[PDB]
């Protein structure tokens, strides 16, 4: 007892904190080795009376007590271990307060109901009566956890205590009270909330602090999801209205954020009544933040809106407002709306988009901003799916050539990914007339991602257009650029041959690409040497065994015999894959 206490104290007073952390980790072992009665009698009041300056070992002993409750003995002895937990809750650091209150969450979870009442309720009432706002925040979290197992009189007492700490003047306990009020109504009853909570909810909404309005309308969307429609329409509907048309753009931004959960809670009919006009007011507010938020949320608002008047309200109200935000010049809201309008385009369908959304789409594509351009080109695939290929290809063919060669490798990548559909739509002749040069420029482009994407793209073109046409046109291009001084373009040619050997049958591989690859096998650059080795590794199973054993084998044994360890290892790997020896 006394000697483990002595080694505990001489370990805890030191210079470093690692020994103190090890002391906290080993405290459970020391206490279990001592015994239950020993730790309850001596070690627990010791850890109450010790005041530590260092928050991490404070946090560690908080979670250590949370794990230590079973070694103390469980629900019979949680009353014994509660006073250290409350003395630990009354501190100055938010993170160790969070650890303390979650340890109390666990304690109240495993606590027996009668003992939980008879001891925990005086403890939480003392914590509420504590003068420190930290103690009030911890208490108001304990009010949220302490509801179900106590009797109805205790429920009423804790309810009026909660109302009192909500009526407390200092704002941080008001924020914590609004958070625990949002958490609190999950366990409360309908009559209880509509009698006590909703009036003090309206008081919190009528308060002056933007933060307490933030967490109060968080509690509002929580109680809106909890409550049925018929009473929230009577009570919290004007409160969320005045919160929405409140002056503070912070809460306007966040109710634009949580508007989708709000309309999900209230149902589509309430949206048809009044949520859409207030939504228009929010998105026509002068703030970039609320505009970005509403522009983000229009898609899920639309798809959570039922189809009885959906297209009607979109044509009459939503779409002129959307093109108004397009006319707005702010960069962020433009990019957000560019993503979300083609998110919601399949809801409108082919006819509505082809009447309205294609000119706006082409304007946003022919906008200067890289952000709107990258967004629109990254999720163009939605209007690809919902709009016919020929229609969109004809609508986009004026702007494809400029967008094909421009600033961002992202937009170039998306154009490369999407263009073979246009090539298959426009046939051999149009692609051969103007897109062939663009494909070659993409092959000789700067970025490696662009090069690999262009290689996959020409795979798609060769499998769409046939082997002999690519033999007529594409194969001379690659085999002619396979001699230039840049090893990067040599790597490009090797990747393209690795694809076109797989796709192009075997005869053109054996009589066209194979001599060029084996004549690039003697290049002085080691990088392209072992890349040719990897190329033969990829290409070998497509050949016949005669050609392999005739010409591939001397090249492979030379690429083993050469001095560099990397190309030698890769040649060994390719040789044992092809099993030529």
């Amino acid at each position: 007892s006394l000697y483990p206490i002595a080694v505990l104290i001489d370990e805890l007073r030191n210079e470093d904190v690692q020994l103190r952390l090890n002391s906290i980790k080993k405290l459970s072992t020391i206490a279990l080795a001592l015994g239950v009665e020993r730790t309850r009698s001596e070690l627990l009041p010791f850890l109450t009376d010790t005041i530590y300056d260092e928050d991490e070992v404070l946090l560690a002993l908080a979670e250590q007590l949370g794990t230590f409750t079973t070694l103390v003995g469980g629900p019979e002895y949680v009353h014994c271990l509660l006073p250290p937990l409350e003395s630990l809750a009354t501190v100055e650091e938010t993170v160790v307060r969070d650890k303390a209150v979650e340890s109390l969450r666990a304690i109240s979870h495993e606590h027996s109901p009668s003992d939980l009442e008879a001891h925990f309720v005086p403890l939480v009432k003392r914590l509420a009566g504590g003068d420190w706002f930290t103690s009030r925040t911890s208490a108001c979290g304990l009010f949220s956890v302490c509801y179900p197992r106590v009797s109805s009189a205790v429920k009423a007492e804790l309810r009026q205590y909660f109302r009192n700490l909500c009526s407390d003047d200092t704002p941080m306990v008001r924020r914590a009270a609004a958070s625990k009020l949002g958490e609190f109504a999950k366990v409360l009853e309908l009559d209880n909330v509509k009698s006590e909570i909703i009036p003090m909810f309206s008081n919190l909404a009528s308060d002056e602090q933007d933060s307490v309005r933030l967490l109060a309308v968080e509690a509002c969307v929580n109680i809106a999801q909890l409550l049925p429609q018929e009473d929230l329409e009577a009570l919290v509907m004007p409160t969320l209205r005045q919160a929405a048309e409140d002056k503070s753009w912070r809460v306007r931004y966040m109710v634009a954020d949580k508007f989708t959960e709000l309309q999900k809670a209230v149902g589509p009919e309430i949206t048809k009544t009044d949520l859409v006009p207030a939504f228009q007011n929010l998105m026509k507010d002068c703030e970039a933040e609320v505009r970005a938020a509403a522009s983000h949320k229009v898609k899920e608002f639309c798809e959570n809106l039922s189809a009885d008047c959906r297209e009607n309200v979109i044509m009459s109200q939503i779409l002129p407002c959307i093109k108004e935000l397009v006319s707005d010049a702010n960069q962020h809201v433009k990019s957000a709306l560019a993503s979300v309008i083609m998110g919601l385009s399949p809801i409108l369908g082919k006819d509505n988009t082809i009447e309205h959304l294609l000119p706006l789409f082409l304007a946003q594509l022919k906008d200067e901003c890289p952000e709107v351009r990258l967004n629109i080109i990254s999720n163009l695939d939605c209007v690809n799916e919902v709009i016919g290929i020929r229609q969109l290809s004809q609508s986009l063919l004026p702007a494809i050539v400029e967008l094909a060669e421009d600033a961002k490798w992202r937009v170039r990548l998306a154009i490369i990914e999407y263009m073979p559909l246009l090539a298959g739509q426009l046939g051999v002749e149009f692609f051969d007339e103007k897109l062939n040069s663009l494909c070659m420029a993409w092959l000789v482009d700067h970025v490696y991602a662009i090069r690999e994407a262009a290689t996959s793209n020409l795979k798609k073109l060769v499998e769409k257009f046939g082997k002999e046409w690519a033999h007529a046109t594409i194969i001379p291009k690659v085999l002619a650029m396979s001699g230039d001084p840049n090893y990067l373009h040599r790597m490009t040619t090797l990747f393209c041959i690795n694809v076109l050997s797989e796709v192009c049958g075997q005869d053109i591989t054996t009589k066209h690409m194979l001599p060029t690859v084996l004549r690039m096998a003697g290049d002085p650059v080691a990088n392209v040497r072992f890349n040719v080795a990897k190329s033969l590794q990829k290409i070998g199973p497509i050949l016949d065994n005669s050609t392999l054993q005739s010409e591939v084998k001397p090249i492979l044994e030379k690429l083993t015999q050469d001095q560099d360890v990397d190309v030698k290892y890769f040649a060994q790997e390719a040789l044992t894959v092809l099993s030529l020896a």
């Binding site: 912070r250 970039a288 962020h332």
Partner: peptide, 6 residues
């Protein structure tokens, strides 16, 4: 920077 994030 058109993002106040308050």
């Amino acid at each position: 920077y058109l993002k106040q994030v308050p």
